[PDB]
């Protein structure tokens with residue numbers, strides 16, 4: 007019998023953002039963004055009621071090599087704290103084994119963010135020099151991509167990054183963006199193209215995406231392995247895609263939100 | 268107990284192509300291309316033996332509105348003639364209901380092919396004029412996209428296309444490409460970006476992709492609903508993606524095959 011779905015998500019612009027007057031608001035009304043709108047459309051199309059909740063540790067999901075314990079939104083699904091994750095959650099082999107993922111609702115690749123005027127055009131450029139530091143988010147698919155890569159240029163990037171001092175790794179996207187902005191061109195941030203493209207068009211308009219994408223992948227809606235929600239959630243994603251709704255929401259939250267001309 | 272997998276596919280460059288000396292060859296050796304190489308890697312990674320076979324009717328898959336019968340590669344899976352489809356087979360809602368699809372191994376969008384010098388930059392351009400004819404492949408996801416679209420510009424394109432005389436629809440990609448080349452700029456062909464991008468770089472180098480993509484989707488490996496092959500095939504796709512193998516094969520069959528500079 008039908009009950010209220012607990013949705014795990016993460017504060018990540020423009021996907022889930024606190025409204026500025028959130029202290030004045032209750033429940034799902036506290037939040038706005040692409041994944042908030044998507045949650046509403048999916049809920050509507052699968053006939054369910056839901057509660058948005060921000061993941062407590064503020065992480066996406068990785069497994070600890072010692073304890074084998076999952077953190078982040080992945081751990082919330084794995085250990086039964088949440089029924090579904092609606093977020094910019096990257097589809098990976100390691101995750102697909104422990105949770106179910108819908109077909110992708112958005113595509114992306116790993117990309118490079120620089121302070122405007124930084125003399126770097128590509129990951130090759132980054133790997134061949136030392137003056138400009140570079141790093142990635144902690145507990146995410148981007149860090150794992152570099153850690154497990156056996157491709158020469160990325161292997162070389164990873165060997166640098168893992169022992170660089172001070173740490174090149176950051177805990178949130180906001181913190182990586184802040185570091186690019188405040189490091190006067192001496193730090194480049196490796197992040198997903200979708201996030202990069204949003205920030206590029208936000209004030210103070212001082213960052214830039216450079217070079218091709220390093221890989222090719224997608225975000226999926228994630229459910230615990232074998233949940234009854236998996237099948238209808240997947241069909242809702244395909245239907246919304248085909249109805250043009252996913253493209254409408256991308257325009258709403260990227261193009262319409264552009265503050266840089 | 269483990270037996271030889273029947274793989275359904277379609278002749279579509281650069282995915283599956285007859286080797287020029289195919290009369291001299293037997294079995295899987297008759298064929299080359301991206302999907303031939305992918306079939307070999309997936310077979311290797313799931314521990315199975317396989318037989319490549321070209322779909323008899325030469326179609327992708329649509330359901331007849333009268334009889335409700337599926338044709339093409341989709342029908343081969345649905346009616347049990349094949350065990351798996353390894354091809355440029357687009358993930359759609361209607362198909363996902365009757366077959367299982369792996370996560371996407373390649374991304375694409377609907378795009379516009381013109382003879383070089385054709386005064387058309389976009390689907391809006393196409394929809395606002397009459398001198399230049401335009402159409403799509405029969406029995407495919409592109410025709411259905413336009414047929415079912417309620418988006419103004421594509422609705423308008425579809426109303427034209429469905430009653431245009433002579434027919435704007437073609438039976439194979441080769442035939443749509445031939446029509447662009449031989450119609451002196453008076454026909455534009457609507458096809459998937461991946462196919463477009465390949466042809467653009469092939470002699471006689473007289474076509475061109477123009478405008479943004481009309482939509483966003485992917486190709487998946489397809490199995491009959493509930494096949495034991497679904498789960499290991501999906502994990503092989505993610506692993507190959509992550510190992511960089513899918514990117515290596517894209518370069519092999521697109522960039523390395525470029526004859527246009």
Ligand SMILES: CCNCc1cn(CC(=O)Nc2sc3c(c2C(N)=O)CCCC3)nc1C(F)(F)F
Pocket residue numbers: 097098109110111112113114222223224225243244247248358359370371372373374375483484485486504505508513
């Ligand atoms: C129904 C919404 N359609 C969006 C969509 C976008 N794609 C393609 C895509 O997002 N690309 C992905 S995602 C991804 C991979 C790849 C790839 N190699 O191209 C490899 C590893 C696993 C995750 N496909 C679709 C859709 F949903 F039709 F299938």
Ligand SMILES: N[C@@H](CCC(=O)O)C(=O)O
Pocket residue numbers: 066067094095096143145146147148149196197198
């Ligand atoms: N979307 C990523 C987080 C961002 C990143 O790693 O760059 C994940 O699911 O882990």
Ligand SMILES: N[C@@H](CCC(=O)O)C(=O)O
Pocket residue numbers: 327328355356357404406407408409410457458459
């Ligand atoms: N890949 C398409 C065929 C090509 C097209 O429709 O443009 C399909 O699966 O139907």
